[PDB]
Amino acid sequence: MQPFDSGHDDLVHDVVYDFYGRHVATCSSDQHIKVFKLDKDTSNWELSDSWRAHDSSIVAIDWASPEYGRIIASASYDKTVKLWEEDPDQEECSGRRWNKLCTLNDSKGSLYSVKFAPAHLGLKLACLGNDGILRLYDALEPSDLRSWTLTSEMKVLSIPPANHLQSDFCLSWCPSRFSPEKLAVSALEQAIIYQRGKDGKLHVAAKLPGHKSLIRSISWAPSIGRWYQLIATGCKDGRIRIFKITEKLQSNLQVELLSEHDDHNGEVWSVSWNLTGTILSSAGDDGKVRLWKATYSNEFKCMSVIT
Amino acid sequence: VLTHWIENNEFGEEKFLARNCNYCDLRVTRSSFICGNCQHVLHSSCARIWWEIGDECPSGCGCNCPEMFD
Amino acid sequence: GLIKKVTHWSYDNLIDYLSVNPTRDEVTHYKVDPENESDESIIKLHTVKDFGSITCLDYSESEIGMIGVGEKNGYLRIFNISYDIRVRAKKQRCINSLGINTNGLIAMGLDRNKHDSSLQIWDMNYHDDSHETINPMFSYCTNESIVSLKFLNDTSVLAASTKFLKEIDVRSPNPIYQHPTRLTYDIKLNPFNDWQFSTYGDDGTLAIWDRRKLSDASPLLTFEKLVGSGAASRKYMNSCFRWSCVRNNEFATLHRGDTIKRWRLGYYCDSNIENLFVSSVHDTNTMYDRVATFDYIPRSNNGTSLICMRQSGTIYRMPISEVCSKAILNNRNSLLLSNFENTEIDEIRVNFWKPEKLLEKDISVIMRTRASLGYGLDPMNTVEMIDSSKQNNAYIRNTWRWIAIAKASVDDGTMVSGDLDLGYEGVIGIWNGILSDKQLNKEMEKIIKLRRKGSPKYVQRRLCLIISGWDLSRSDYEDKYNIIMKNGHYEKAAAWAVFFGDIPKAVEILGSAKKERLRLIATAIAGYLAYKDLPGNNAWRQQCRKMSSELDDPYLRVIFAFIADNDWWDILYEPAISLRERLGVALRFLNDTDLTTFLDRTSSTVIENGELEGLILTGITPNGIDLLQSYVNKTSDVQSAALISIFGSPRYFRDQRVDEWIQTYRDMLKSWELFSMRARFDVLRSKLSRTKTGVLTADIKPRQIYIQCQNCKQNINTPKYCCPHCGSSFPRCAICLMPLGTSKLKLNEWFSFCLSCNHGMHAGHAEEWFDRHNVCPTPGCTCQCN
Ligand SMILES: [Zn+2]
Ligand SMILES: [Zn+2]
Ligand SMILES: [Zn+2]
Ligand SMILES: [Zn+2]
Ligand SMILES: [Zn+2]
Ligand SMILES: [Zn+2]
Ligand SMILES: [Zn+2]
């Protein structure tokens, strides 16, 4: 359990792994993005580049698939989405290593979550903020990665939330190459699964019931090849809800709750899956990270607890 | 000699996957290796790693590239 | 109750505190140590008592210990803790606020007097100590009751009356603004942003204001019914709201005396003025209930602790727990932990259960280690690698042994010829049959009549014996007995002898073994040959049944079950022995009307149970894909499903699940940077997708690039050192000046053409040049090709 200091001057808001697992990018509240790499010799994380990205606190970053190159998204509270591509011929830890590409200003609200699409849908992207409007950005031109065109625009909430009331938004894509395109969208106390219809426009396909309070994290379990899909929900209650989605509007799909654990006694902040969807890591308000696995049954039981 | 990409009329991801190495699935832009029988790219490092251990094209088209790259 | 945090007084790391009891009677000075959580850090140094009923307090940052204390009667007792003067206004009334500036200006907030001004400011060095009344240097706010005031700078002061917010400077008698509002109580200044302050009202409606928004007038933020009431009724208020002293855009509020909510703010600029909004709310429960007021503690490494004073005046120290913000996983089963408080990031590498042991026992890192070791590329090699490993992987070795047998059968030309394929089929497909019946029967007899150097279904039982690998000769049976004995598994040799019926040979094999226990088992087995004519229900058969029940070895278990009673049905349902042996002893010794029922029962068991050894019965068929799908549902092993389903799916049947498994395993191999294993997997897929004709049914990548010459604009090679369509000269290598040749791969045989500058060198020449250089070697190119 060796710790490493990211060197930020403020809070760290989102940390994401890349596809290969040897790189992490750490956004923060001091408007900086620091990209760390794993040295194969020293076996320790070290900084690759640090640069000032936005004009407000950055709350969500996401790596793109390496078949599209080294692209890092960044959503922040200044209503901007900044896309960064790595220049191979540039000095380490200089600030000019990652070159700015686009600034999607189509959102009239402070954003919360940005999530790249899987590697079977294109170089798409998703955004959600305190405006109730879902925005999808496709990079339709492979020649230049700067003509990011908005293609879908679905409204999730009827009205934007109040200035003082707190609210959270999170996104999770479905990484199944052999299923219609789905998007798990969380807005306050609502979690909706969209689906790409035959007309090219997303429609409300299935709504996850429950969720008496704010939803802090949605993670779609990786489609390893099973006949059922899983969504992990970290609510503002103690509940780590796991939904069993079975698909059979191209195709109808049913939502069934698989498990509901009150084993944290507080707000569940982040819930996240493994590569194969076997280990579920849930972090809650008790200061402890609980791992979950399924043994001899479909219902998920608890495992090692890390404090 | 100028290297010319095949202008394939594509719609989705294969437009992006046309200019990708067949060993690492990364975009190739400098120091490539081109076969003649099969029209597939490789990086120079990817080619020098793969042909120390392999015998066919890494995309699995069935082309014996050590004997058919001319 | 008022706990006021004072800095710039201690040369050490300790932070001084000033406390007022909730009955508003005493003033107590503290020195709190941040590095120890226990209550012994709260050191009570001094106490000055009998101060009437205190209504306000302030401190002077310029000189240490100058602590002004107000009262309800009107006396502004200013003294030192670390002289003692008692001043008052010229008219005796209640003092409601107090502020001491850095330069020395001391303000005072009085009640509403028609013939007096409320906001009275003087300097300490310019006041006569022989008079009880004061000499106001600057006076404002006549006929008003000033309830809150604070010194923004060395000159200006921000005072709030019962109805107005005033920003009054001493350089000019005109205030900057006067905003009419009710939320004018307890102006608190943010220690990071000087242009932001927060008040509240009688209804508890707290509001964060911006001075530049009011100067020009809405509040920056509002919070309906956030804090306690009694502002316009009680002059003794518990401070149930404190600005954060550890990071910007944060504050903490106290609700119902038991829970503390830390509200973190977000800011966006519409383009200096930042429109605030609440991002996250963090709830912390106090150690003890009934708390009136609290205060922050600045800790090392951006930590937070809360010193709190109860309703009874007891002061304790409540730490803030380090709540994890993000717990992401990894492809390498590594856990990364981020906190809501500090900067550092926790990492749990893979190198109630232990964390590392659970991450090492997960199937992700098992699949990664197997893929690194080369699992599934050669079935005989993976049988060799699984057998030379002890963990206890039992069904995997048997199913890969069957896959090796079937691949050897296909590679020998057996059961791929004729008008029908019948490749990688199972026992169920052969047994159930399913264009003419006589034509398929005679070509299947021809399939039998290929290695020729009292049952009706003899043209199917022999095919099942060929498929399962149980058509071996008796001399080769003796050779197999010698092989199994040389491997050390004497019990498996005895089980195979019992299976093939030569019980005296089982006695001979188990006799003269390396163990005495095996010799005792051999004696028990030998006690059957002169005994099988007995009717039964005797003590020897009872002892044999007891030994079958108690013993741990499954081979000797089924040996005792067959010896005690001469029936095969106790052997065909034992799960601990391999299914290939059970199918051998089912095809060898069973009626067809019973063998069909056994096959149906075992197939219906292995389809739903997900057993990988059911592939002998079902084959690599759509029902085999159902078996592998149930296995993936039960185990989440897509690696084995991919390496099994690539043998027969795109050659015979197009199904979406196999494509999903193949794409998932390729993405996993790319995720672990096992590009070599992905390329070997792809070429193995292309090798195993070839039909009997030879047509490749796999999906390959389309053609990407081709070489032109810009003299006839055609391809230089057809799917010499000159172009084959216009005769123009090919470009030469920049090192050895040798041209391009057009007509086990050595490095010095192909050009490494850059796709940016279109300059080509031999690969050995390019490696030798670009190792010590980073520019294109051609005269006039600036392109870093490596
Ligand atoms: Zn490559
Ligand atoms: Zn090829
Ligand atoms: Zn080729
Ligand atoms: Zn030509
Ligand atoms: Zn050369
Ligand atoms: Zn060049
Ligand atoms: Zn070049």
mmCIF file of N, CA, C and O in Angstrom, chain A residues 106-179:
data_model
loop_
_atom_site.group_PDB
_atom_site.id
_atom_site.type_symbol
_atom_site.label_atom_id
_atom_site.label_comp_id
_atom_site.label_asym_id
_atom_site.label_seq_id
_atom_site.Cartn_x
_atom_site.Cartn_y
_atom_site.Cartn_z
ATOM 1 N N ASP A 106 -20.702 24.371 -26.027
ATOM 2 C CA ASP A 106 -22.127 24.265 -26.311
ATOM 3 C C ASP A 106 -22.972 24.077 -25.058
ATOM 4 O O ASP A 106 -24.204 24.096 -25.156
ATOM 5 N N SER A 107 -22.352 23.903 -23.895
ATOM 6 C CA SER A 107 -23.060 23.636 -22.652
ATOM 7 C C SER A 107 -23.169 24.923 -21.843
ATOM 8 O O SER A 107 -22.154 25.554 -21.533
ATOM 9 N N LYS A 108 -24.396 25.306 -21.508
ATOM 10 C CA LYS A 108 -24.649 26.484 -20.680
ATOM 11 C C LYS A 108 -24.816 26.073 -19.218
ATOM 12 O O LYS A 108 -25.830 26.337 -18.572
ATOM 13 N N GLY A 109 -23.784 25.411 -18.703
ATOM 14 C CA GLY A 109 -23.772 24.958 -17.327
ATOM 15 C C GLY A 109 -22.447 24.339 -16.932
ATOM 16 O O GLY A 109 -21.716 23.840 -17.791
ATOM 17 N N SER A 110 -22.124 24.371 -15.640
ATOM 18 C CA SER A 110 -20.867 23.812 -15.152
ATOM 19 C C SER A 110 -20.899 22.289 -15.210
ATOM 20 O O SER A 110 -21.779 21.655 -14.618
ATOM 21 N N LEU A 111 -19.942 21.703 -15.926
ATOM 22 C CA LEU A 111 -19.986 20.275 -16.197
ATOM 23 C C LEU A 111 -19.498 19.464 -15.003
ATOM 24 O O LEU A 111 -18.804 19.962 -14.114
ATOM 25 N N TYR A 112 -19.869 18.190 -15.002
ATOM 26 C CA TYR A 112 -19.515 17.259 -13.940
ATOM 27 C C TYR A 112 -18.768 16.027 -14.423
ATOM 28 O O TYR A 112 -17.830 15.586 -13.757
ATOM 29 N N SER A 113 -19.165 15.443 -15.551
ATOM 30 C CA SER A 113 -18.600 14.176 -15.991
ATOM 31 C C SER A 113 -18.384 14.168 -17.496
ATOM 32 O O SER A 113 -19.247 14.614 -18.257
ATOM 33 N N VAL A 114 -17.221 13.671 -17.915
ATOM 34 C CA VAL A 114 -16.927 13.411 -19.320
ATOM 35 C C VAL A 114 -16.453 11.967 -19.435
ATOM 36 O O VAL A 114 -15.678 11.485 -18.600
ATOM 37 N N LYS A 115 -16.967 11.252 -20.434
ATOM 38 C CA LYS A 115 -16.638 9.843 -20.622
ATOM 39 C C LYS A 115 -16.486 9.573 -22.109
ATOM 40 O O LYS A 115 -17.411 9.840 -22.883
ATOM 41 N N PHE A 116 -15.329 9.054 -22.509
ATOM 42 C CA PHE A 116 -15.149 8.633 -23.889
ATOM 43 C C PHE A 116 -15.971 7.384 -24.185
ATOM 44 O O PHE A 116 -16.288 6.591 -23.295
ATOM 45 N N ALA A 117 -16.313 7.216 -25.459
ATOM 46 C CA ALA A 117 -17.039 6.045 -25.905
ATOM 47 C C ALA A 117 -16.124 4.821 -25.951
ATOM 48 O O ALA A 117 -14.898 4.951 -25.909
ATOM 49 N N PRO A 118 -16.699 3.616 -26.011
ATOM 50 C CA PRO A 118 -15.897 2.415 -26.280
ATOM 51 C C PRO A 118 -15.232 2.457 -27.650
ATOM 52 O O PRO A 118 -15.466 3.339 -28.480
ATOM 53 N N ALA A 119 -14.403 1.445 -27.897
ATOM 54 C CA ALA A 119 -13.641 1.349 -29.136
ATOM 55 C C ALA A 119 -14.391 0.585 -30.222
ATOM 56 O O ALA A 119 -13.763 -0.078 -31.057
ATOM 57 N N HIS A 120 -15.724 0.660 -30.228
ATOM 58 C CA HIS A 120 -16.533 0.097 -31.297
ATOM 59 C C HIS A 120 -17.566 1.077 -31.834
ATOM 60 O O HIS A 120 -18.268 0.744 -32.795
ATOM 61 N N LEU A 121 -17.683 2.269 -31.245
ATOM 62 C CA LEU A 121 -18.687 3.242 -31.647
ATOM 63 C C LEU A 121 -18.117 4.413 -32.434
ATOM 64 O O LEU A 121 -18.889 5.158 -33.049
ATOM 65 N N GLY A 122 -16.806 4.596 -32.428
ATOM 66 C CA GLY A 122 -16.151 5.746 -33.016
ATOM 67 C C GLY A 122 -15.329 6.474 -31.977
ATOM 68 O O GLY A 122 -15.057 5.963 -30.887
ATOM 69 N N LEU A 123 -14.917 7.684 -32.326
ATOM 70 C CA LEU A 123 -14.296 8.576 -31.351
ATOM 71 C C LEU A 123 -15.352 9.540 -30.813
ATOM 72 O O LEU A 123 -15.305 10.756 -30.998
ATOM 73 N N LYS A 124 -16.347 8.954 -30.154
ATOM 74 C CA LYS A 124 -17.424 9.729 -29.570
ATOM 75 C C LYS A 124 -17.046 10.157 -28.157
ATOM 76 O O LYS A 124 -15.967 9.846 -27.647
ATOM 77 N N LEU A 125 -17.965 10.868 -27.510
ATOM 78 C CA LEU A 125 -17.716 11.482 -26.216
ATOM 79 C C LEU A 125 -19.071 11.833 -25.617
ATOM 80 O O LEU A 125 -20.062 11.975 -26.334
ATOM 81 N N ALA A 126 -19.107 11.958 -24.293
ATOM 82 C CA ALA A 126 -20.332 12.302 -23.590
ATOM 83 C C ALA A 126 -20.036 13.332 -22.512
ATOM 84 O O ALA A 126 -18.954 13.336 -21.919
ATOM 85 N N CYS A 127 -21.006 14.212 -22.270
ATOM 86 C CA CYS A 127 -20.879 15.237 -21.246
ATOM 87 C C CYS A 127 -22.205 15.458 -20.539
ATOM 88 O O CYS A 127 -23.278 15.326 -21.133
ATOM 89 N N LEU A 128 -22.113 15.819 -19.262
ATOM 90 C CA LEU A 128 -23.281 16.164 -18.469
ATOM 91 C C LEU A 128 -22.883 17.191 -17.421
ATOM 92 O O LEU A 128 -21.828 17.072 -16.794
ATOM 93 N N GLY A 129 -23.729 18.201 -17.246
ATOM 94 C CA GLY A 129 -23.471 19.246 -16.276
ATOM 95 C C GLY A 129 -24.720 19.656 -15.527
ATOM 96 O O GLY A 129 -25.729 18.947 -15.563
ATOM 97 N N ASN A 130 -24.672 20.801 -14.846
ATOM 98 C CA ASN A 130 -25.843 21.296 -14.135
ATOM 99 C C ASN A 130 -26.758 22.074 -15.078
ATOM 100 O O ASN A 130 -27.145 23.210 -14.787
ATOM 101 N N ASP A 131 -27.100 21.465 -16.215
ATOM 102 C CA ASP A 131 -28.040 22.031 -17.168
ATOM 103 C C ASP A 131 -29.107 21.042 -17.607
ATOM 104 O O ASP A 131 -30.057 21.452 -18.284
ATOM 105 N N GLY A 132 -28.986 19.766 -17.249
ATOM 106 C CA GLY A 132 -29.968 18.769 -17.617
ATOM 107 C C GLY A 132 -29.923 18.308 -19.055
ATOM 108 O O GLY A 132 -30.846 17.612 -19.490
ATOM 109 N N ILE A 133 -28.897 18.682 -19.815
ATOM 110 C CA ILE A 133 -28.816 18.377 -21.239
ATOM 111 C C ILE A 133 -27.603 17.491 -21.486
ATOM 112 O O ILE A 133 -26.482 17.841 -21.097
ATOM 113 N N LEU A 134 -27.829 16.350 -22.133
ATOM 114 C CA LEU A 134 -26.761 15.428 -22.499
ATOM 115 C C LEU A 134 -26.222 15.814 -23.869
ATOM 116 O O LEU A 134 -26.996 16.088 -24.789
ATOM 117 N N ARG A 135 -24.896 15.841 -24.003
ATOM 118 C CA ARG A 135 -24.260 16.251 -25.248
ATOM 119 C C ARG A 135 -23.276 15.185 -25.701
ATOM 120 O O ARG A 135 -22.471 14.696 -24.901
ATOM 121 N N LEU A 136 -23.341 14.832 -26.983
ATOM 122 C CA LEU A 136 -22.457 13.846 -27.589
ATOM 123 C C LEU A 136 -21.626 14.514 -28.675
ATOM 124 O O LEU A 136 -22.168 15.229 -29.522
ATOM 125 N N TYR A 137 -20.316 14.279 -28.649
ATOM 126 C CA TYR A 137 -19.388 14.894 -29.591
ATOM 127 C C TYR A 137 -18.631 13.801 -30.330
ATOM 128 O O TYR A 137 -17.906 13.016 -29.711
ATOM 129 N N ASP A 138 -18.798 13.760 -31.650
ATOM 130 C CA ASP A 138 -18.148 12.782 -32.512
ATOM 131 C C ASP A 138 -17.038 13.459 -33.304
ATOM 132 O O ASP A 138 -17.233 14.553 -33.842
ATOM 133 N N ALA A 139 -15.877 12.807 -33.372
ATOM 134 C CA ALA A 139 -14.772 13.261 -34.215
ATOM 135 C C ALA A 139 -14.847 12.487 -35.529
ATOM 136 O O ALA A 139 -14.180 11.474 -35.732
ATOM 137 N N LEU A 140 -15.689 12.988 -36.434
ATOM 138 C CA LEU A 140 -16.008 12.272 -37.662
ATOM 139 C C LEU A 140 -14.887 12.304 -38.691
ATOM 140 O O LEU A 140 -14.924 11.512 -39.638
ATOM 141 N N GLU A 141 -13.901 13.185 -38.539
ATOM 142 C CA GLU A 141 -12.833 13.305 -39.526
ATOM 143 C C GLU A 141 -11.558 12.676 -38.983
ATOM 144 O O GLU A 141 -10.957 13.222 -38.044
ATOM 145 N N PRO A 142 -11.112 11.538 -39.521
ATOM 146 C CA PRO A 142 -9.846 10.952 -39.053
ATOM 147 C C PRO A 142 -8.607 11.721 -39.478
ATOM 148 O O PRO A 142 -7.536 11.488 -38.902
ATOM 149 N N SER A 143 -8.710 12.614 -40.464
ATOM 150 C CA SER A 143 -7.540 13.357 -40.922
ATOM 151 C C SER A 143 -7.080 14.376 -39.884
ATOM 152 O O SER A 143 -5.885 14.475 -39.585
ATOM 153 N N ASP A 144 -8.014 15.137 -39.320
ATOM 154 C CA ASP A 144 -7.710 16.089 -38.259
ATOM 155 C C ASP A 144 -8.624 15.882 -37.057
ATOM 156 O O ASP A 144 -9.843 15.741 -37.198
ATOM 157 N N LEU A 145 -8.020 15.793 -35.877
ATOM 158 C CA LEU A 145 -8.769 15.589 -34.639
ATOM 159 C C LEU A 145 -9.100 16.912 -33.956
ATOM 160 O O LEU A 145 -8.869 17.097 -32.762
ATOM 161 N N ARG A 146 -9.648 17.850 -34.725
ATOM 162 C CA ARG A 146 -10.099 19.125 -34.183
ATOM 163 C C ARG A 146 -11.519 19.492 -34.576
ATOM 164 O O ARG A 146 -12.101 20.379 -33.940
ATOM 165 N N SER A 147 -12.100 18.847 -35.587
ATOM 166 C CA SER A 147 -13.472 19.134 -36.010
ATOM 167 C C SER A 147 -14.438 18.241 -35.230
ATOM 168 O O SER A 147 -15.084 17.337 -35.762
ATOM 169 N N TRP A 148 -14.526 18.519 -33.932
ATOM 170 C CA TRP A 148 -15.414 17.773 -33.048
ATOM 171 C C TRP A 148 -16.824 18.331 -33.190
ATOM 172 O O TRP A 148 -17.102 19.458 -32.768
ATOM 173 N N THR A 149 -17.712 17.542 -33.785
ATOM 174 C CA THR A 149 -19.057 17.978 -34.134
ATOM 175 C C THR A 149 -20.077 17.391 -33.168
ATOM 176 O O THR A 149 -20.094 16.177 -32.938
ATOM 177 N N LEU A 150 -20.912 18.254 -32.596
ATOM 178 C CA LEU A 150 -22.024 17.792 -31.777
ATOM 179 C C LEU A 150 -23.049 17.095 -32.662
ATOM 180 O O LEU A 150 -23.431 17.611 -33.717
ATOM 181 N N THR A 151 -23.496 15.920 -32.234
ATOM 182 C CA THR A 151 -24.407 15.103 -33.025
ATOM 183 C C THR A 151 -25.718 14.800 -32.322
ATOM 184 O O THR A 151 -26.774 14.838 -32.958
ATOM 185 N N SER A 152 -25.684 14.500 -31.027
ATOM 186 C CA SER A 152 -26.884 14.212 -30.257
ATOM 187 C C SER A 152 -27.000 15.190 -29.098
ATOM 188 O O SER A 152 -25.991 15.589 -28.507
ATOM 189 N N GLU A 153 -28.235 15.575 -28.777
ATOM 190 C CA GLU A 153 -28.480 16.528 -27.695
ATOM 191 C C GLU A 153 -29.815 16.167 -27.050
ATOM 192 O O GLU A 153 -30.875 16.582 -27.530
ATOM 193 N N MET A 154 -29.752 15.397 -25.968
ATOM 194 C CA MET A 154 -30.927 14.925 -25.249
ATOM 195 C C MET A 154 -31.020 15.642 -23.909
ATOM 196 O O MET A 154 -30.020 15.759 -23.195
ATOM 197 N N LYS A 155 -32.215 16.118 -23.573
ATOM 198 C CA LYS A 155 -32.453 16.764 -22.289
ATOM 199 C C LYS A 155 -32.854 15.719 -21.256
ATOM 200 O O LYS A 155 -33.767 14.921 -21.493
ATOM 201 N N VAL A 156 -32.171 15.727 -20.117
ATOM 202 C CA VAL A 156 -32.396 14.747 -19.059
ATOM 203 C C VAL A 156 -33.337 15.283 -17.990
ATOM 204 O O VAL A 156 -34.317 14.631 -17.630
ATOM 205 N N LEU A 157 -33.057 16.474 -17.471
ATOM 206 C CA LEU A 157 -33.910 17.117 -16.485
ATOM 207 C C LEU A 157 -34.783 18.182 -17.137
ATOM 208 O O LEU A 157 -34.455 18.732 -18.190
ATOM 209 N N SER A 158 -35.917 18.460 -16.491
ATOM 210 C CA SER A 158 -36.825 19.483 -17.001
ATOM 211 C C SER A 158 -36.246 20.880 -16.810
ATOM 212 O O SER A 158 -36.320 21.719 -17.716
ATOM 213 N N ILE A 159 -35.667 21.143 -15.644
ATOM 214 C CA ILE A 159 -35.105 22.449 -15.312
ATOM 215 C C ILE A 159 -33.696 22.256 -14.761
ATOM 216 O O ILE A 159 -33.386 21.178 -14.232
ATOM 217 N N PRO A 160 -32.807 23.246 -14.891
ATOM 218 C CA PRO A 160 -31.514 23.155 -14.214
ATOM 219 C C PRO A 160 -31.695 23.179 -12.707
ATOM 220 O O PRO A 160 -32.667 23.762 -12.195
ATOM 221 N N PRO A 161 -30.794 22.548 -11.956
ATOM 222 C CA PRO A 161 -30.920 22.546 -10.493
ATOM 223 C C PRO A 161 -30.647 23.924 -9.907
ATOM 224 O O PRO A 161 -30.129 24.830 -10.564
ATOM 225 N N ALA A 162 -31.019 24.071 -8.637
ATOM 226 C CA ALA A 162 -30.879 25.345 -7.950
ATOM 227 C C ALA A 162 -29.411 25.685 -7.704
ATOM 228 O O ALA A 162 -28.520 24.837 -7.802
ATOM 229 N N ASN A 163 -29.175 26.962 -7.395
ATOM 230 C CA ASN A 163 -27.818 27.450 -7.167
ATOM 231 C C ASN A 163 -27.203 26.833 -5.915
ATOM 232 O O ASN A 163 -26.005 26.528 -5.889
ATOM 233 N N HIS A 164 -28.009 26.645 -4.871
ATOM 234 C CA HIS A 164 -27.522 26.207 -3.569
ATOM 235 C C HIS A 164 -27.614 24.706 -3.350
ATOM 236 O O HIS A 164 -26.770 24.147 -2.642
ATOM 237 N N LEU A 165 -28.625 24.046 -3.911
ATOM 238 C CA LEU A 165 -28.790 22.613 -3.708
ATOM 239 C C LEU A 165 -27.688 21.846 -4.428
ATOM 240 O O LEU A 165 -27.419 22.085 -5.609
ATOM 241 N N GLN A 166 -27.048 20.926 -3.714
ATOM 242 C CA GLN A 166 -25.993 20.117 -4.303
ATOM 243 C C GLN A 166 -26.581 19.029 -5.195
ATOM 244 O O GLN A 166 -27.699 18.549 -4.981
ATOM 245 N N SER A 167 -25.829 18.678 -6.234
ATOM 246 C CA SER A 167 -26.253 17.666 -7.188
ATOM 247 C C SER A 167 -25.025 17.053 -7.840
ATOM 248 O O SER A 167 -23.973 17.690 -7.934
ATOM 249 N N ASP A 168 -25.165 15.805 -8.280
ATOM 250 C CA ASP A 168 -24.064 15.058 -8.863
ATOM 251 C C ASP A 168 -24.525 14.408 -10.159
ATOM 252 O O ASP A 168 -25.684 14.011 -10.299
ATOM 253 N N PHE A 169 -23.598 14.306 -11.109
ATOM 254 C CA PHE A 169 -23.847 13.661 -12.389
ATOM 255 C C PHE A 169 -22.676 12.755 -12.736
ATOM 256 O O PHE A 169 -21.517 13.124 -12.528
ATOM 257 N N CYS A 170 -22.981 11.570 -13.259
ATOM 258 C CA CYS A 170 -21.941 10.625 -13.639
ATOM 259 C C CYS A 170 -22.391 9.852 -14.869
ATOM 260 O O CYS A 170 -23.589 9.663 -15.100
ATOM 261 N N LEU A 171 -21.414 9.404 -15.656
ATOM 262 C CA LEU A 171 -21.659 8.711 -16.911
ATOM 263 C C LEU A 171 -20.943 7.371 -16.914
ATOM 264 O O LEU A 171 -19.907 7.199 -16.266
ATOM 265 N N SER A 172 -21.505 6.422 -17.656
ATOM 266 C CA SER A 172 -20.867 5.127 -17.862
ATOM 267 C C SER A 172 -21.349 4.563 -19.188
ATOM 268 O O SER A 172 -22.557 4.428 -19.402
ATOM 269 N N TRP A 173 -20.409 4.233 -20.068
ATOM 270 C CA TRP A 173 -20.723 3.671 -21.372
ATOM 271 C C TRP A 173 -20.756 2.148 -21.311
ATOM 272 O O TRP A 173 -20.171 1.521 -20.428
ATOM 273 N N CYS A 174 -21.439 1.555 -22.292
ATOM 274 C CA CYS A 174 -21.523 0.108 -22.410
ATOM 275 C C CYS A 174 -20.463 -0.401 -23.370
ATOM 276 O O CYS A 174 -20.570 -0.152 -24.580
ATOM 277 N N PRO A 175 -19.429 -1.114 -22.896
ATOM 278 C CA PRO A 175 -18.345 -1.569 -23.771
ATOM 279 C C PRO A 175 -18.607 -2.941 -24.389
ATOM 280 O O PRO A 175 -17.778 -3.853 -24.302
ATOM 281 N N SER A 176 -19.767 -3.098 -25.017
ATOM 282 C CA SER A 176 -20.116 -4.325 -25.719
ATOM 283 C C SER A 176 -20.119 -4.022 -27.209
ATOM 284 O O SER A 176 -20.889 -3.174 -27.672
ATOM 285 N N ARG A 177 -19.278 -4.734 -27.957
ATOM 286 C CA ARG A 177 -19.150 -4.517 -29.391
ATOM 287 C C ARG A 177 -20.265 -5.166 -30.197
ATOM 288 O O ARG A 177 -20.331 -4.958 -31.413
ATOM 289 N N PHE A 178 -21.131 -5.941 -29.555
ATOM 290 C CA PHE A 178 -22.159 -6.736 -30.217
ATOM 291 C C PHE A 178 -23.514 -6.501 -29.562
ATOM 292 O O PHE A 178 -24.256 -7.428 -29.234
ATOM 293 N N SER A 179 -23.835 -5.227 -29.354
ATOM 294 C CA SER A 179 -25.086 -4.804 -28.741
ATOM 295 C C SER A 179 -25.360 -3.378 -29.190
ATOM 296 O O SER A 179 -24.419 -2.663 -29.552
#
